[PDB]
Amino acid sequence: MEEIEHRTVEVNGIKMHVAEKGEGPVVLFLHGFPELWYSWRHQILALSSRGYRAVAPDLRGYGDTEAPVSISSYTGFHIVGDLIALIDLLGVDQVFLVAHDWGAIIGWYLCTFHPDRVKAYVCLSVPLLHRDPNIRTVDAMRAMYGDDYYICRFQKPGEMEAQMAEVGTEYVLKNILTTRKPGPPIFPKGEYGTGFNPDMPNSLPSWLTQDDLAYYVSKYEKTGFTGPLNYYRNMNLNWELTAPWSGGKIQVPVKFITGELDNVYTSLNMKEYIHGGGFKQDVPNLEEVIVQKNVAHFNNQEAAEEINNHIYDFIKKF
Numbered sequence: 556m557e558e559i560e561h562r563t564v565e566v567n568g569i570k571m572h573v574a575e576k577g578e579g580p581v582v583l584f585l586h587g588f589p590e591l592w593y594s595w596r597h598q599i600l601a602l603s604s605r606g607y608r609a610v611a612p613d614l615r616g617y618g619d620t621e622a623p624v625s626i627s628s629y630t631g632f633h634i635v636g637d638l639i640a641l642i643d644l645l646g647v648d649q650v651f652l653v654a655h656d657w658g659a660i661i662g663w664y665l666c667t668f669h670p671d672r673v674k675a676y677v678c679l680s681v682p683l684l685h686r687d688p689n690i691r692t693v694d695a696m697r698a699m700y701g702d703d704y705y706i707c708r709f710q711k712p713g714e715m716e717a718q719m720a721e722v723g724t725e726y727v728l729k730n731i732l733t734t735r736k737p738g739p740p741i742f743p744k745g746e747y748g749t750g751f752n753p754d755m756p757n758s759l760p761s762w763l764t765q766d767d768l769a770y771y772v773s774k775y776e777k778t779g780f781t782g783p784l785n786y787y788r789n790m791n792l793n794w795e796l797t798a799p800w801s802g803g804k805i806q807v808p809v810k811f812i813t814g815e816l817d818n819v820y821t822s823l824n825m826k827e828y829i830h831g832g833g834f835k836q837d838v839p840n841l842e843e844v845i846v847q848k849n850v851a852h853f854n855n856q857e858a859a860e861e862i863n864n865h866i867y868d869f870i871k872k873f
């Protein structure tokens with residue numbers, strides 16, 4: 556951990572916290588919601604140890620990275636803009652890419668816009684968001700699960716923030732991190748309530764120490780949730796702006812990995828997309844699909860060594 560270097564860089568008009576360790580080919584790690592660079596701590600240690608330059612930023616709006624006030628400053632294009640400037644600062648032609656959750660959606664955009672900068676992509680949890688020309692991303696979600704589905708509830712400015720404020724930052728973070736209930740997260744009406752997890756454990760699961768949860772809390776206490784939530788608030792706008800890529804394919808070699816109990820895997824007809832041919836058709840060089848039994852959404856933390864191995868083995872192929 557100590558050997559993990561922390562710096563602040565100027566990228567795409569913002570100041571970004573980058574955590575770094577190691578030397579060798581760059582592995583760029585993109586975290587998700589509601590996480591931080593810390594989410595990758597085990598992978599940063601492992602990959603650095605194994606002869607790679609591990610790079611894990613706090614994305615725009617998270618942690619120690621600048622958080623622009625405008626909701627519209629949170630399109631996929633803004634975030635990829637940040638990452639392309641970062642990659643230039645690293646002074647390399649290509650990176651290996653590893654991404655989870657919202658970080659993975661941004662990863663898909665990076666691969667869409669600049670496949671030639673990504674040598675291989677280890678994608679966790681969220682597979683490519685297929686652009687259906689007939690229905691916007693969040694509309695499809697609302698049709699399927701109605702208004703209290705979490706993404707839907709995330710859309711209105713300031714609301715989810717106040718609800719989360721009411722139950723407390725630590726409650727929210729524990730509530731989400733500990734969830735193992737499959738299926739669509741549907742909230743109780745008008746409040747956070749049990750949120751993503753109606754069955755919170757008394758003690759943290761063995762992959763998450765009190766110091767880990769405390770780190771997350773210490774940053775979210777400071778930044779709040781606005782920036783991270785803003786990502787979801789641009790999903791329809793992202794659907795509009797990505798029209799030029801409608802019907803396109805991703806050429807970057809991909810290894811997809813998900814926990815079997817991931818709410819993502821277990822909803823939105825994801826299984827059908829992932830396994831039924833659609834994912835492979837959008838992404839012709841999808842080489843492997845790994846489902847981790849008895850592993851929840853946060854698979855890079857819950858199954859850290861296993862993911863470390865899957866990443867190492869995959870990138871060393873090249």
Ligand SMILES: O=[N+]([O-])c1ccc([C@H]2CO2)cc1
Pocket residue numbers: 587588589656657731734740751818819852853
């Ligand atoms: O609660 N989670 O485990 C969780 C966290 C983050 C996301 C991103 C896709 O919206 C979904 C679910």
